[PDB]
């Protein structure tokens, strides 16, 4: 707002996995207040995954998130008679949240029966670099690289 | 024993306490016994009224009612204090029951 940034909300360690990204991805998945439901979904995704991964599931999900992490986005601005976009660097806490928000949004429209294994194959194909959010990464990246010419308007 | 039970009731504070603690005390000087005043949870009745006489829904006023309940439960029964209990100048806003 006007008076500086607002304080962020801490998120405690997951009981199943000594990691925070699970606790935060489940909260992203959360809708209407079904923490229990979203949590069993995330856990079921990882526990379905370990069979086809062999690697530890949070290690696999980190591999996916390192792929789908944005670096430089295309934030808009209008100066004269024509609006255009500005390539701007994305700080990591925004970048990871945006990446896994894309994951949730495109796992809500992927083609299987239900979202448990939908998200499961999303995680594995993002750790292997083939997915829909994966291709969004390098299309948003190239859209911003094609507007790097306007990076000299950094507000 | 549990032969006499009163249910002093009123609308507000500093009336029930005065009517109980210092006016039912007039019996213990005769050798009786009370267990002290007993507070009872207070109800809260709520209304909501349109402020304007016409056309304004989004402006209201709230009016409420508190009725405070107390019990005493004097125990020791004595024949010469029944009349004493009957002859008590209760304050105007306090009502008394006998059980």
């Amino acid at each position: 707002p006007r008076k500086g940034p607002a304080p962020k909300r801490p998120l405690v360690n997951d009981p199943v996995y000594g990691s925070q990204l699970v606790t935060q991805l489940v909260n992203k998945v959360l809708l209407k207040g079904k923490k229990s439901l979203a949590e069993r979904i995330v856990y079921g995704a990882l526990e379905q995954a370990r069979d086809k991964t062999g690697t530890d599931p949070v290690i696999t999900l980190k591999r996916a998130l390192d792929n789908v992490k944005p670096a430089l986005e295309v934030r808009s601005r209008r100066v004269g008679g024509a609006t255009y976009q500005v390539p701007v660097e994305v700080r990591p806490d925004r970048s990871t949240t945006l990446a896994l928000r894309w994951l949730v949004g495109y796992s809500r429209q992927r083609r299987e029966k239900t979202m448990i294994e939908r998200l499961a194959n999303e995680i594995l194909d993002a750790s292997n670099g083939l997915g829909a959010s994966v291709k969004r990464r390098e299309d948003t990246h190239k859209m911003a690289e094609a507007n790097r010419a306007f990076a000299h308007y950094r507000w | 024993g549990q032969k006499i039970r009163i249910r002093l009731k009123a609308y507000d504070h500093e009336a029930i306490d005065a009517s109980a603690r210092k006016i039912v005390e007039t019996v213990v000087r005769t050798g009786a016994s009370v267990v002290g005043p007993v507070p009872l949870p207070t109800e809260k009745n709520v209304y909501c009224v349109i402020r304007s006489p016409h056309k304004y829904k989004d402006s209201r006023e709230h009016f409420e009612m508190r009725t405070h309940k107390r019990l005493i439960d004097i125990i020791d029964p004595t024949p010469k204090t029944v009349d004493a209990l009957m002859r008590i100048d209760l304050p105007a806003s306090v009502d008394v029951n006998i059980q």
Binding site: - | Y11, R51, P53, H62, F63, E64, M65, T67
Partner: protein
């Protein structure tokens, strides 16, 4: 409201389902309570005047 109407409301109409309640002070046919027998405006100003006991404002 109208004086004939307040008289009708105060009377004993046939077919008791027909009986209704008006304001105790102005005869308003709407927004009248039962524990108060008194409409909304003529309850507001009466309670502000404090002429009916046990009433105040609130804040929770």
């Amino acid at each position: 409201a109208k004086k004939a109407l307040v008289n009708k409301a105060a009377g004993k109409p046939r077919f008791a389902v027909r009986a209704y309640t008006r304001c105790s002070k102005c005869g308003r046919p709407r927004a009248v309570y039962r524990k108060f027998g008194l409409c909304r405006i003529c309850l507001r100003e009466m309670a502000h005047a404090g002429e009916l006991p046990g009433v105040q404002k609130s804040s929770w």
